[PDB]
Enzyme design. Structure first.
Site, PDB file in Angstrom:
ATOM      1  N   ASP A  37       0.834  -1.203   0.000  1.00  0.00           N
ATOM      2  CA  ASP A  37       0.000   0.000   0.000  1.00  0.00           C
ATOM      3  C   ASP A  37       0.869   1.254   0.000  1.00  0.00           C
ATOM      4  O   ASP A  37       1.474   1.597   1.019  1.00  0.00           O
ATOM      5  CB  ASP A  37      -0.941  -0.006   1.204  1.00  0.00           C
ATOM      6  CG  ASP A  37      -1.772   1.268   1.314  1.00  0.00           C
ATOM      7  OD1 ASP A  37      -2.058   1.907   0.279  1.00  0.00           O
ATOM      8  OD2 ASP A  37      -2.136   1.639   2.450  1.00  0.00           O
ATOM      9  N   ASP A  77      -1.982   5.745  -5.227  1.00  0.00           N
ATOM     10  CA  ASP A  77      -2.350   4.985  -4.027  1.00  0.00           C
ATOM     11  C   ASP A  77      -2.665   3.544  -4.427  1.00  0.00           C
ATOM     12  O   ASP A  77      -3.774   3.232  -4.880  1.00  0.00           O
ATOM     13  CB  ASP A  77      -3.528   5.654  -3.317  1.00  0.00           C
ATOM     14  CG  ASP A  77      -3.923   4.946  -2.028  1.00  0.00           C
ATOM     15  OD1 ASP A  77      -3.236   3.988  -1.622  1.00  0.00           O
ATOM     16  OD2 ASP A  77      -4.932   5.359  -1.424  1.00  0.00           O
TER      17      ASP A  77
END
Ligand code: NAG
Length: 332
Positions: free
Chosen positions: A34, A220
């Protein structure tokens, strides 16, 4: 060089998991990688929710090298609609045969029961790859620690996303024309927390919806959907509606709907209807959601399945001799 590859599996939703070994002897977990966060989280045997019992659970009592933290505690994070809670500890990790000793991480001991996000996904943890400024527990983030202990590895990682054939992979220490064509376009990171760059313009077809003032894209990998702020989203949904996408007419809709163009100086990121429309059971819906980021509200997220499948993305950490950059190239 010292480049190495970490195969990635797409399970459902969007998030991409890879193999991570934790402790001695090694226990295997499959966390999300992430770029939108910095901590490491690992689901442990202390979590007795059914959403925890169904996944691989790390047992810290079985690791010779685990050291529980005495002074850090009650680590808690919102997780989309859900939330996770637990304690803090340290262990040795291994990623793609590269060792990371003395790594601090969150041990999940509780998952929310809110529907309930943890029932829709197979969550085993998170390896945050954002900047040190978002680190919550411990004094060094995972990627920083790996580089410190493997000093011949260049501080960069890249995502090659190819979910149609199970060939997705995370590449660390460099890049390869096996995964991209054309030039890599380098975008300077403006703020070192999220991988955040300046966005110059955004078009929906011929309609310019941005930007007259400084605006931002955040890359992201932890988000499924791309996002827009509130104002632009009202424009978007007036231009782009859900529509019937049957066997007869779905190719017609993919050819007809507008191309969304993100403009970064010379780089133009084009998303065609086949990227931003989700086909489910004879209906196409646009894969965009409203997100307003505080300082801001001029931030747009680019994430996973839609965008990264068509664009090889390189995350270059700044060092003593270069600034942080995001590189973008045409995938394949
Ligand atoms: C791990 O921690 C111990 C004690 O804090 C220290 O002596 C050792 O050098 C550390 N190892 C690494 C690779 O940082």
């Amino acid at each position: 060089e010292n480049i190495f590859l970490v195969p990635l599996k797409h399970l459902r939703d969007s998030q991409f998991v890879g193999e991570l070994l934790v402790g001695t002897p090694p226990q295997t977990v499959y966390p999300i990688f992430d770029t939108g966060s910095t901590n490491v989280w690992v689901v442990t045997t202390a979590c007795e929710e059914e959403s925890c019992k169904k996944v691989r659970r790390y047992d810290p009592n079985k690791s010779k090298t685990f050291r529980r933290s005495f002074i850090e505690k009650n680590l808690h994070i919102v997780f989309g609609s859900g939330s996770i809670s637990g304690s803090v500890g340290t262990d040795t990790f291994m990623l793609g045969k590269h060792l990371v000793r003395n790594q601090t991480f969150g041990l999940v001991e509780s998952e929310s029961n809110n529907d309930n996000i943890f029932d829709y996904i197979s969550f085993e943890g998170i390896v945050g790859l954002g900047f040190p400024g978002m680190l919550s527990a411990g004094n060094i983030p995972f990627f920083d620690n790996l580089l410190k202990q493997n000093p011949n590895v260049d501080p960069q990682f890249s995502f090659y996303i190819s979910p149609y054939d199970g060939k997705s992979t995370l590449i660390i220490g460099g890049i390869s024309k096996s995964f991209y064509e054309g030039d890599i376009y380098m975008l300077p990171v403006l703020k070192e927390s999220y991988w955040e760059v300046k966005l110059d313009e955004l078009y929906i077809g011929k309609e310019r919806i941005c930007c007259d003032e400084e605006s931002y894209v955040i890359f992201d990998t932890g988000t499924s959907y791309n996002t827009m702020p509130s104002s632009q989203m009202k424009t978007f949904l007036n231009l782009i509606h859900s529509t019937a996408c049957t066997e007869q007419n779905y190719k017609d809709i993919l050819k007809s709907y507008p191309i969304i163009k993100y403009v970064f100086g010379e780089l133009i990121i084009e998303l065609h209807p086949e990227e931003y429309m989700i086909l489910n059971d004879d209906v196409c819906m646009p894969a965009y959601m409203q997100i307003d980021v505080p300082s801001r509200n001029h931030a747009y997220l680019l994430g996973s399945l839609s965008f990264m499948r068509n664009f090889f993305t390189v995350f270059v950490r700044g060092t003593e001799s270069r600034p942080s950059m995001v590189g973008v190239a045409r995938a394949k």
